[PDB]
């Protein structure tokens with residue numbers, strides 16, 4: 001039975017555009033979905049897409065025989081500086097399958113065991129800063145969490161030291177990154193983008209792109225002048241299928257790609273986790289009993305991090321409520337029918353809105369806004385395609401196990417060494433630069449006086 005598709009109100013030539021006049025576009029689209037349900041069309045001048053929210057319809061869009069990965073308007077604007085690297089290439093470009101095969105070995109169990117000692121070095125530098133603050137003083141949470149995650153990928157991936165804890169303002173690569181992502185998001189809401197009114201926005205965009213690339217030159221110069229790491233395989237590895245290596249131009253696009261996607265989403269996860277623990281004290285208490293029982297030595301081991309079983313349940317429930325890269329896009333390979341009721345033509349686009357999928361009552365029950373880590377107690381026992389914070393199929397996230405090992409280690413050392421206080425009674429305010437993070441979150445931390453090691 002062929003249905004007409006739902007759609008919000010239109011305004012002559014403007015289409016649906018005056019319904020997103022905001023710096024928080026994903027939060028606004030969540031409100032249109034609660035009003036119309038599992039599927040709606042959305043139009044702006046020149047272009048069209050379709051937003052999906054239920055488990056039954058997202059199960060079908062994830063069939064790789066019928067639909068593949070699409071570049072959204074948002075990733076087309078980022079491609080202006082990340083090129084044909086892993087995150088912004090089409091699946092049919094020569095460099096996608098090639099880079100994939102050449103770089104996959106850097107994420108194996110052997111290599112993970114080899115990164116552990118470098119992760120502890122940055123972790124110790126964070127506990128030392130908080131042990132040395134005076135009693136009149138407080139902590140800025142998302143700012144210190146991005147100091148730890150940028151330095152950690154710098155050392156493990158490239159053997160370079162950004163030294164972010166020897167500065168009291170943010171690193172200069174960070175300042176230009178955050179104005180570039182912001183500009184790309186603002187571009188999406190303009191009617192006529194060519195006018196002389198947007199000439200200065202365009203010139204500032206080029207200045208932030210040159211700042212990022214100046215850092216790439218610096219890393220290339222240090223390896224030259226100087227390992228079995230990510231940079232090693234970029235300069236020497238060969239694709240077992242075609243026998244080719246990567247050219248110079250593609251290699252620069254991969255440095256930029258791994259520095260940005262390799263820290264920004266991990267910082268965001270650690271900030272939401274601490275926010276939910278200080279607003280739920282029966283949950284905080286229990287996660288602290290685990291850290292004190294399991295971590296009996298002066299610095300943590302690789303095998304001990306694997307035993308921190310409840311701290312992992314906490315991290316997954318934080319990603320269910322606020323997944324830190326909150327959408328991904330798809331296109332139809334040939335004419336087809338979706339759900340048994342909506343015909344589609346070769347080429348039309350679809351968009352998975354991840355925070356709505358994670359509030360489907362037919363799958364999780366009627367209490368979807370509560371914070372309850374115990375949902376994840378026997379995981380093999382939750383349906384397939386209900387939980388997707390890392391994407392789908394052959395284009396899923398390559399860094400999944402890296403991030404989760406980093407986060408479980410750092411959160412357990414935080415809970416062993418300090419008690420925390422919500423001193424300003426903080427109200428949640430979520431900032432959007434394509435990705436998500438809580439703005440202005442601040443705390444106080446009192447030390448339990450327990451010594452560190454070497």
Ligand code: HEM
Pocket residue numbers: 069086087100257258261262263265266269323324325327328329389390391392394395396397398399400402403
């Ligand atoms: C919890 C933190 C993280 C989250 C939530 C996350 C999420 C994602 C998502 C949603 C995609 C798919 C996007 C799409 O289909 O358009 C993706 C792909 C990717 N991710 Fe992550 N990520 C995280 C951490 C990392 C880390 C630590 C690295 C690197 C060390 C990384 C590197 C990449 C790369 C290179 C791709 C492109 C894969 C390909 O298409 O070949 N991410 N990630």
Ligand SMILES: CCCCCC/C=C\CCCCCCCC(=O)O
Pocket residue numbers: 025026074078082087188257260261325326327328434435
């Ligand atoms: C390497 C570059 C970093 C990639 C950062 C972006 C990742 C997540 C993209 C989510 C896009 C959400 C678009 C919302 C706006 C709209 O639909 O109008």
